[PDB]
mmCIF file of C-alpha atoms in Angstrom:
data_model
loop_
_atom_site.group_PDB
_atom_site.id
_atom_site.type_symbol
_atom_site.label_atom_id
_atom_site.label_comp_id
_atom_site.label_asym_id
_atom_site.label_seq_id
_atom_site.Cartn_x
_atom_site.Cartn_y
_atom_site.Cartn_z
ATOM 1 C CA UNK A 1 -36.113 21.617 -39.771
ATOM 2 C CA UNK A 2 -33.810 23.623 -42.021
ATOM 3 C CA UNK A 3 -35.810 26.626 -40.849
ATOM 4 C CA UNK A 4 -35.347 25.783 -37.153
ATOM 5 C CA UNK A 5 -31.577 25.705 -37.728
ATOM 6 C CA UNK A 6 -31.361 29.029 -39.516
ATOM 7 C CA UNK A 7 -33.432 30.539 -36.704
ATOM 8 C CA UNK A 8 -31.347 29.144 -33.839
ATOM 9 C CA UNK A 9 -28.814 31.592 -32.479
ATOM 10 C CA UNK A 10 -26.043 29.884 -30.513
ATOM 11 C CA UNK A 11 -23.441 31.646 -28.274
ATOM 12 C CA UNK A 12 -20.779 33.544 -30.233
ATOM 13 C CA UNK A 13 -17.001 33.807 -29.584
ATOM 14 C CA UNK A 14 -16.897 36.510 -26.873
ATOM 15 C CA UNK A 15 -19.590 34.702 -24.856
ATOM 16 C CA UNK A 16 -17.993 31.306 -25.330
ATOM 17 C CA UNK A 17 -14.702 32.714 -24.139
ATOM 18 C CA UNK A 18 -16.117 34.731 -21.234
ATOM 19 C CA UNK A 19 -18.210 31.871 -19.923
ATOM 20 C CA UNK A 20 -15.423 29.284 -20.142
ATOM 21 C CA UNK A 21 -13.179 31.763 -18.336
ATOM 22 C CA UNK A 22 -15.759 32.265 -15.551
ATOM 23 C CA UNK A 23 -16.068 28.509 -15.151
ATOM 24 C CA UNK A 24 -12.327 27.926 -14.839
ATOM 25 C CA UNK A 25 -12.117 30.741 -12.272
ATOM 26 C CA UNK A 26 -14.922 29.083 -10.284
ATOM 27 C CA UNK A 27 -13.306 25.635 -10.244
ATOM 28 C CA UNK A 28 -9.953 27.179 -9.199
ATOM 29 C CA UNK A 29 -11.460 28.540 -5.967
ATOM 30 C CA UNK A 30 -14.213 25.971 -5.451
ATOM 31 C CA UNK A 31 -14.797 25.435 -1.750
ATOM 32 C CA UNK A 32 -16.555 22.192 -2.639
ATOM 33 C CA UNK A 33 -14.412 19.063 -3.126
ATOM 34 C CA UNK A 34 -12.509 18.880 -6.410
ATOM 35 C CA UNK A 35 -14.009 15.599 -7.550
ATOM 36 C CA UNK A 36 -17.581 16.419 -6.641
ATOM 37 C CA UNK A 37 -20.406 16.530 -9.204
ATOM 38 C CA UNK A 38 -20.740 20.275 -8.571
ATOM 39 C CA UNK A 39 -17.142 20.991 -9.617
ATOM 40 C CA UNK A 40 -16.840 18.244 -12.250
ATOM 41 C CA UNK A 41 -19.905 19.500 -14.075
ATOM 42 C CA UNK A 42 -18.375 22.972 -14.318
ATOM 43 C CA UNK A 43 -15.177 21.476 -15.737
ATOM 44 C CA UNK A 44 -17.135 19.532 -18.379
ATOM 45 C CA UNK A 45 -19.107 22.639 -19.375
ATOM 46 C CA UNK A 46 -16.015 24.815 -19.490
ATOM 47 C CA UNK A 47 -14.088 22.392 -21.707
ATOM 48 C CA UNK A 48 -17.062 22.219 -24.010
ATOM 49 C CA UNK A 49 -17.305 26.024 -24.250
ATOM 50 C CA UNK A 50 -13.594 26.559 -24.813
ATOM 51 C CA UNK A 51 -13.604 23.697 -27.295
ATOM 52 C CA UNK A 52 -16.176 25.715 -29.218
ATOM 53 C CA UNK A 53 -14.181 28.901 -28.887
ATOM 54 C CA UNK A 54 -11.058 27.181 -30.143
ATOM 55 C CA UNK A 55 -12.974 26.079 -33.251
ATOM 56 C CA UNK A 56 -14.349 29.524 -33.873
ATOM 57 C CA UNK A 57 -10.804 30.911 -33.652
ATOM 58 C CA UNK A 58 -9.443 28.322 -36.065
ATOM 59 C CA UNK A 59 -12.083 29.280 -38.663
ATOM 60 C CA UNK A 60 -11.471 32.973 -38.159
ATOM 61 C CA UNK A 61 -7.664 32.534 -38.361
ATOM 62 C CA UNK A 62 -7.084 35.496 -36.004
ATOM 63 C CA UNK A 63 -3.571 34.368 -35.319
ATOM 64 C CA UNK A 64 -1.068 33.424 -37.994
ATOM 65 C CA UNK A 65 2.437 32.174 -37.183
ATOM 66 C CA UNK A 66 4.245 34.819 -39.234
ATOM 67 C CA UNK A 67 2.817 37.894 -37.490
ATOM 68 C CA UNK A 68 3.919 40.617 -35.046
ATOM 69 C CA UNK A 69 2.047 41.029 -31.717
ATOM 70 C CA UNK A 70 1.216 44.715 -32.536
ATOM 71 C CA UNK A 71 -0.885 43.498 -35.461
ATOM 72 C CA UNK A 72 -3.294 41.797 -33.092
ATOM 73 C CA UNK A 73 -6.096 44.010 -31.807
ATOM 74 C CA UNK A 74 -6.300 44.732 -28.107
ATOM 75 C CA UNK A 75 -9.526 42.800 -27.525
ATOM 76 C CA UNK A 76 -8.350 39.815 -29.553
ATOM 77 C CA UNK A 77 -5.351 39.460 -27.232
ATOM 78 C CA UNK A 78 -7.384 37.471 -24.715
ATOM 79 C CA UNK A 79 -8.190 34.733 -27.246
ATOM 80 C CA UNK A 80 -4.545 33.725 -27.153
ATOM 81 C CA UNK A 81 -5.315 32.337 -23.684
ATOM 82 C CA UNK A 82 -7.780 29.658 -24.855
ATOM 83 C CA UNK A 83 -5.309 26.722 -25.177
ATOM 84 C CA UNK A 84 -3.898 27.556 -21.739
ATOM 85 C CA UNK A 85 -7.348 27.519 -20.186
ATOM 86 C CA UNK A 86 -8.059 24.185 -21.924
ATOM 87 C CA UNK A 87 -4.915 22.758 -20.323
ATOM 88 C CA UNK A 88 -5.960 24.095 -16.933
ATOM 89 C CA UNK A 89 -9.452 22.689 -17.104
ATOM 90 C CA UNK A 90 -8.288 19.343 -18.462
ATOM 91 C CA UNK A 91 -6.115 18.920 -15.349
ATOM 92 C CA UNK A 92 -9.138 19.628 -13.142
ATOM 93 C CA UNK A 93 -10.901 16.443 -14.314
ATOM 94 C CA UNK A 94 -10.977 13.549 -11.830
ATOM 95 C CA UNK A 95 -11.149 10.061 -13.389
ATOM 96 C CA UNK A 96 -8.100 7.999 -12.439
ATOM 97 C CA UNK A 97 -8.737 5.325 -15.064
ATOM 98 C CA UNK A 98 -8.151 8.078 -17.636
ATOM 99 C CA UNK A 99 -5.517 10.192 -15.885
ATOM 100 C CA UNK A 100 -2.698 9.419 -18.311
ATOM 101 C CA UNK A 101 -5.046 10.431 -21.129
ATOM 102 C CA UNK A 102 -5.824 13.750 -19.423
ATOM 103 C CA UNK A 103 -2.112 14.533 -18.852
ATOM 104 C CA UNK A 104 -1.183 13.974 -22.510
ATOM 105 C CA UNK A 105 -4.196 16.013 -23.676
ATOM 106 C CA UNK A 106 -3.315 18.792 -21.221
ATOM 107 C CA UNK A 107 0.353 18.782 -22.128
ATOM 108 C CA UNK A 108 -0.662 19.296 -25.757
ATOM 109 C CA UNK A 109 -2.909 22.259 -24.888
ATOM 110 C CA UNK A 110 -0.084 23.949 -22.948
ATOM 111 C CA UNK A 111 2.443 23.320 -25.699
ATOM 112 C CA UNK A 112 -0.021 24.925 -28.131
ATOM 113 C CA UNK A 113 -0.276 27.944 -25.887
ATOM 114 C CA UNK A 114 3.493 28.207 -25.433
ATOM 115 C CA UNK A 115 4.213 27.590 -29.100
ATOM 116 C CA UNK A 116 1.978 30.506 -30.096
ATOM 117 C CA UNK A 117 3.299 32.883 -27.415
ATOM 118 C CA UNK A 118 6.795 31.981 -28.558
ATOM 119 C CA UNK A 119 6.173 32.874 -32.272
ATOM 120 C CA UNK A 120 4.603 36.160 -31.122
ATOM 121 C CA UNK A 121 7.586 36.948 -28.849
ATOM 122 C CA UNK A 122 5.281 37.533 -25.835
ATOM 123 C CA UNK A 123 8.278 36.831 -23.574
ATOM 124 C CA UNK A 124 11.762 35.247 -23.761
ATOM 125 C CA UNK A 125 11.670 31.535 -22.815
ATOM 126 C CA UNK A 126 12.748 28.024 -23.748
ATOM 127 C CA UNK A 127 9.951 26.158 -25.500
ATOM 128 C CA UNK A 128 9.477 22.635 -24.103
ATOM 129 C CA UNK A 129 9.701 19.569 -26.377
ATOM 130 C CA UNK A 130 6.496 18.670 -28.231
ATOM 131 C CA UNK A 131 6.225 15.281 -26.571
ATOM 132 C CA UNK A 132 6.947 13.844 -23.111
ATOM 133 C CA UNK A 133 9.584 13.873 -21.833
ATOM 134 C CA UNK A 134 11.019 17.378 -21.824
ATOM 135 C CA UNK A 135 14.453 16.697 -20.322
ATOM 136 C CA UNK A 136 15.389 18.936 -17.385
ATOM 137 C CA UNK A 137 18.299 18.244 -15.018
ATOM 138 C CA UNK A 138 17.467 24.134 -11.860
ATOM 139 C CA UNK A 139 15.831 25.153 -8.570
ATOM 140 C CA UNK A 140 16.896 28.750 -9.021
ATOM 141 C CA UNK A 141 14.696 28.951 -12.113
ATOM 142 C CA UNK A 142 11.746 28.212 -9.867
ATOM 143 C CA UNK A 143 12.574 30.805 -7.247
ATOM 144 C CA UNK A 144 12.975 33.379 -10.048
ATOM 145 C CA UNK A 145 9.721 32.141 -11.628
ATOM 146 C CA UNK A 146 7.921 32.404 -8.252
ATOM 147 C CA UNK A 147 8.983 35.968 -7.637
ATOM 148 C CA UNK A 148 8.007 36.792 -11.219
ATOM 149 C CA UNK A 149 4.517 35.346 -10.794
ATOM 150 C CA UNK A 150 3.974 37.184 -7.500
ATOM 151 C CA UNK A 151 4.972 40.434 -9.182
ATOM 152 C CA UNK A 152 2.743 39.844 -12.247
ATOM 153 C CA UNK A 153 -0.242 38.896 -10.052
ATOM 154 C CA UNK A 154 0.225 42.059 -8.043
ATOM 155 C CA UNK A 155 0.412 44.354 -11.092
ATOM 156 C CA UNK A 156 -2.657 42.591 -12.477
ATOM 157 C CA UNK A 157 -4.546 43.069 -9.237
ATOM 158 C CA UNK A 158 -3.968 46.801 -9.548
ATOM 159 C CA UNK A 159 -5.283 47.034 -13.099
ATOM 160 C CA UNK A 160 -8.143 44.527 -13.301
ATOM 161 C CA UNK A 161 -10.930 46.832 -12.217
ATOM 162 C CA UNK A 162 -9.775 49.730 -14.409
ATOM 163 C CA UNK A 163 -9.868 47.486 -17.487
ATOM 164 C CA UNK A 164 -13.023 45.507 -16.763
ATOM 165 C CA UNK A 165 -14.855 48.681 -15.852
ATOM 166 C CA UNK A 166 -13.646 50.451 -19.028
ATOM 167 C CA UNK A 167 -11.543 53.165 -17.350
ATOM 168 C CA UNK A 168 -8.257 52.246 -19.032
ATOM 169 C CA UNK A 169 -6.718 53.648 -22.213
ATOM 170 C CA UNK A 170 -5.645 51.320 -25.013
ATOM 171 C CA UNK A 171 -2.027 51.361 -23.810
ATOM 172 C CA UNK A 172 -3.172 50.238 -20.358
ATOM 173 C CA UNK A 173 -5.542 47.652 -21.824
ATOM 174 C CA UNK A 174 -2.792 45.999 -23.906
ATOM 175 C CA UNK A 175 -0.287 46.093 -21.057
ATOM 176 C CA UNK A 176 -2.858 44.286 -18.943
ATOM 177 C CA UNK A 177 -3.443 41.550 -21.499
ATOM 178 C CA UNK A 178 0.325 41.208 -22.019
ATOM 179 C CA UNK A 179 0.659 40.590 -18.291
ATOM 180 C CA UNK A 180 -1.955 37.802 -18.417
ATOM 181 C CA UNK A 181 -0.111 36.137 -21.273
ATOM 182 C CA UNK A 182 3.176 36.199 -19.397
ATOM 183 C CA UNK A 183 1.510 34.977 -16.223
ATOM 184 C CA UNK A 184 0.119 32.071 -18.248
ATOM 185 C CA UNK A 185 3.466 31.377 -19.886
ATOM 186 C CA UNK A 186 4.873 30.807 -16.396
ATOM 187 C CA UNK A 187 1.874 28.663 -15.400
ATOM 188 C CA UNK A 188 2.103 26.506 -18.556
ATOM 189 C CA UNK A 189 5.857 26.015 -18.150
ATOM 190 C CA UNK A 190 5.361 24.987 -14.566
ATOM 191 C CA UNK A 191 2.522 22.631 -15.460
ATOM 192 C CA UNK A 192 4.416 20.896 -18.179
ATOM 193 C CA UNK A 193 7.189 20.142 -15.686
ATOM 194 C CA UNK A 194 4.560 18.831 -13.295
ATOM 195 C CA UNK A 195 2.856 16.757 -16.015
ATOM 196 C CA UNK A 196 6.115 15.154 -17.131
ATOM 197 C CA UNK A 197 6.771 14.037 -13.579
ATOM 198 C CA UNK A 198 3.282 12.534 -13.229
ATOM 199 C CA UNK A 199 3.476 10.711 -16.558
ATOM 200 C CA UNK A 200 6.859 9.208 -15.637
ATOM 201 C CA UNK A 201 5.244 7.862 -12.487
ATOM 202 C CA UNK A 202 2.062 6.616 -14.185
ATOM 203 C CA UNK A 203 3.955 4.953 -17.026
ATOM 204 C CA UNK A 204 6.254 3.116 -14.644
ATOM 205 C CA UNK A 205 3.473 1.003 -13.143
ATOM 206 C CA UNK B 1 -0.166 34.772 15.805
ATOM 207 C CA UNK B 2 0.458 31.534 13.992
ATOM 208 C CA UNK B 3 -1.693 29.213 16.047
ATOM 209 C CA UNK B 4 -3.064 27.816 12.773
ATOM 210 C CA UNK B 5 0.112 25.766 12.460
ATOM 211 C CA UNK B 6 -0.195 24.498 16.023
ATOM 212 C CA UNK B 7 -3.608 23.030 15.181
ATOM 213 C CA UNK B 8 -2.266 21.424 11.986
ATOM 214 C CA UNK B 9 0.760 19.935 13.761
ATOM 215 C CA UNK B 10 -1.393 18.712 16.651
ATOM 216 C CA UNK B 11 -3.753 17.080 14.131
ATOM 217 C CA UNK B 12 -0.903 15.467 12.185
ATOM 218 C CA UNK B 13 0.644 13.915 15.279
ATOM 219 C CA UNK B 14 -2.607 12.017 15.889
ATOM 220 C CA UNK B 15 -1.902 10.767 12.317
ATOM 221 C CA UNK B 16 -4.972 12.471 10.838
ATOM 222 C CA UNK B 17 -4.220 13.861 7.367
ATOM 223 C CA UNK B 18 -4.798 17.497 6.435
ATOM 224 C CA UNK B 19 -7.207 18.588 3.693
ATOM 225 C CA UNK B 20 -6.182 19.616 0.161
ATOM 226 C CA UNK B 21 -6.929 23.266 0.979
ATOM 227 C CA UNK B 22 -4.703 23.095 4.020
ATOM 228 C CA UNK B 23 -2.016 21.095 2.241
ATOM 229 C CA UNK B 24 -2.066 23.723 -0.477
ATOM 230 C CA UNK B 25 -1.940 26.570 2.036
ATOM 231 C CA UNK B 26 0.964 24.917 3.819
ATOM 232 C CA UNK B 27 3.057 24.506 0.676
ATOM 233 C CA UNK B 28 2.597 28.163 -0.240
ATOM 234 C CA UNK B 29 3.686 29.367 3.209
ATOM 235 C CA UNK B 30 6.788 27.180 2.817
ATOM 236 C CA UNK B 31 7.406 28.423 -0.721
ATOM 237 C CA UNK B 32 7.205 31.928 0.644
ATOM 238 C CA UNK B 33 9.885 31.299 3.238
ATOM 239 C CA UNK B 34 12.060 29.248 0.898
ATOM 240 C CA UNK B 35 12.201 31.955 -1.739
ATOM 241 C CA UNK B 36 14.190 34.433 0.367
ATOM 242 C CA UNK B 37 17.518 32.772 1.303
ATOM 243 C CA UNK B 38 8.622 20.901 20.725
ATOM 244 C CA UNK B 39 8.383 17.100 20.958
ATOM 245 C CA UNK B 40 6.790 14.245 18.985
ATOM 246 C CA UNK B 41 7.250 8.362 12.067
ATOM 247 C CA UNK B 42 10.069 10.748 12.966
ATOM 248 C CA UNK B 43 12.631 9.790 15.644
ATOM 249 C CA UNK B 44 14.488 11.722 18.377
ATOM 250 C CA UNK B 45 18.257 12.250 18.129
ATOM 251 C CA UNK B 46 20.443 13.201 21.050
ATOM 252 C CA UNK B 47 23.904 14.547 20.237
ATOM 253 C CA UNK B 48 27.159 13.595 22.040
ATOM 254 C CA UNK B 49 30.539 15.207 22.877
ATOM 255 C CA UNK B 50 30.668 19.033 23.085
ATOM 256 C CA UNK B 51 21.317 25.253 20.199
ATOM 257 C CA UNK B 52 18.759 23.390 17.988
ATOM 258 C CA UNK B 53 16.708 20.144 18.211
ATOM 259 C CA UNK B 54 17.459 17.052 16.133
ATOM 260 C CA UNK B 55 15.186 14.715 14.203
ATOM 261 C CA UNK B 56 15.664 11.692 12.007
ATOM 262 C CA UNK B 57 13.298 10.870 9.191
ATOM 263 C CA UNK B 58 11.781 7.443 8.580
ATOM 264 C CA UNK B 59 12.654 4.159 10.249
ATOM 265 C CA UNK B 60 15.754 2.990 8.375
ATOM 266 C CA UNK B 61 15.569 3.578 4.581
ATOM 267 C CA UNK B 62 12.279 2.953 2.660
ATOM 268 C CA UNK B 63 7.204 7.757 3.671
ATOM 269 C CA UNK B 64 3.545 8.467 4.448
ATOM 270 C CA UNK B 65 1.490 11.518 3.464
ATOM 271 C CA UNK B 66 1.113 12.554 7.079
ATOM 272 C CA UNK B 67 4.840 12.176 7.656
ATOM 273 C CA UNK B 68 5.939 14.499 4.859
ATOM 274 C CA UNK B 69 3.043 16.805 5.630
ATOM 275 C CA UNK B 70 4.267 17.034 9.218
ATOM 276 C CA UNK B 71 7.820 17.583 8.052
ATOM 277 C CA UNK B 72 6.754 20.684 6.188
ATOM 278 C CA UNK B 73 4.453 22.042 8.902
ATOM 279 C CA UNK B 74 7.244 21.626 11.463
ATOM 280 C CA UNK B 75 9.900 23.466 9.493
ATOM 281 C CA UNK B 76 7.420 26.284 8.821
ATOM 282 C CA UNK B 77 6.546 26.697 12.513
ATOM 283 C CA UNK B 78 10.043 26.299 13.875
ATOM 284 C CA UNK B 79 12.568 27.118 11.112
ATOM 285 C CA UNK B 80 16.140 26.559 12.328
ATOM 286 C CA UNK B 81 14.802 25.495 15.796
ATOM 287 C CA UNK B 82 14.369 21.957 14.440
ATOM 288 C CA UNK B 83 17.041 20.349 12.318
ATOM 289 C CA UNK B 84 15.694 17.387 10.324
ATOM 290 C CA UNK B 85 17.852 14.596 8.877
ATOM 291 C CA UNK B 86 17.574 11.460 6.735
ATOM 292 C CA UNK B 87 20.125 9.057 5.215
ATOM 293 C CA UNK B 88 20.965 9.333 1.493
ATOM 294 C CA UNK B 89 11.432 11.556 -2.572
ATOM 295 C CA UNK B 90 7.946 12.645 -3.643
ATOM 296 C CA UNK B 91 8.660 10.711 -6.799
ATOM 297 C CA UNK B 92 7.834 7.179 -5.679
ATOM 298 C CA UNK B 93 4.867 5.119 -6.874
ATOM 299 C CA UNK B 94 3.923 4.178 -3.306
ATOM 300 C CA UNK B 95 3.758 7.812 -2.263
ATOM 301 C CA UNK B 96 1.786 8.880 -5.307
ATOM 302 C CA UNK B 97 -0.712 6.048 -4.755
ATOM 303 C CA UNK B 98 -0.905 6.957 -1.080
ATOM 304 C CA UNK B 99 -1.855 10.540 -1.919
ATOM 305 C CA UNK B 100 -4.341 9.263 -4.456
ATOM 306 C CA UNK B 101 -5.976 6.939 -1.895
ATOM 307 C CA UNK B 102 -6.207 9.633 0.802
ATOM 308 C CA UNK B 103 -7.481 12.421 -1.450
ATOM 309 C CA UNK B 104 -9.911 12.823 -4.286
ATOM 310 C CA UNK B 105 -7.029 13.142 -6.692
ATOM 311 C CA UNK B 106 -3.414 14.016 -7.560
ATOM 312 C CA UNK B 107 -3.347 17.632 -6.398
ATOM 313 C CA UNK B 108 -1.766 17.077 -2.997
ATOM 314 C CA UNK B 109 1.006 15.097 -4.684
ATOM 315 C CA UNK B 110 1.525 17.976 -7.104
ATOM 316 C CA UNK B 111 1.687 20.504 -4.289
ATOM 317 C CA UNK B 112 4.439 18.521 -2.556
ATOM 318 C CA UNK B 113 6.301 17.624 -5.731
ATOM 319 C CA UNK B 114 6.268 21.313 -6.571
ATOM 320 C CA UNK B 115 7.336 22.308 -3.059
ATOM 321 C CA UNK B 116 10.247 19.866 -2.873
ATOM 322 C CA UNK B 117 11.607 21.246 -6.154
ATOM 323 C CA UNK B 118 12.592 24.191 -3.974
ATOM 324 C CA UNK B 119 14.836 22.107 -1.688
#
């Protein structure tokens, strides 16, 4: 029994990350209904995988809070995305009895993502409050944010193949991962706004 | 060729909801327009004393998923051709619950809530 444990080889970090990423991607374009067993099972598996990645990362301490972004290796850059993916997947759960729980859990994931990106100066932005509600009183920001996202997504679409198929220099590789991080900063910001509105509604009930 | 809208609008007038995928697709088309610069829930307005068509939203005060869905689909098909007016929006418990009853979940409500943040 101690033997059987030594001998078992579980998935490592890169697999855990890559699989959880595939799963999120799948759920995001699922042509099946959102709250179907087919989709919900992928969400559950994804959260589990990422939860395991997150723990691996904690133990490895890849990212400190007093570090410069150049000090992080190119291939480690992606791992910064884990909390943001966790937020995304958490939102994809359907279970109305526990919706308020999911929002608070998701909010926390996104704050974690944003908080890290902010220490590492990935982009200039205002970090939302740690706890609902993040006061915001305004539409322009969204138009600007929309145009930004369209432009990031386009640049990304031009580089994805090159990177994934190993035909990109290090400079290119890092620029690509930078672009993901920024894209996900925008997404997280936007989701926190969305979450705060949904909590306000759910609470008042 | 935007006949796709015609089908949606036709379907909405019979008071049949659209699907999440369609509701999502609709909001994005709108967002796309927004970020740059014929007869039917809604009620007809004639003008008087000395162009475009006029429409009033709701009965008097108090909105259904199909209503606001139609609102969006209309303005996307017709632009300035149809002016739409109310008195003096996505953020009501009754509307959230209505989305939640008519769909697996809260996504549709998010799509609209997001979209109306552009108005």
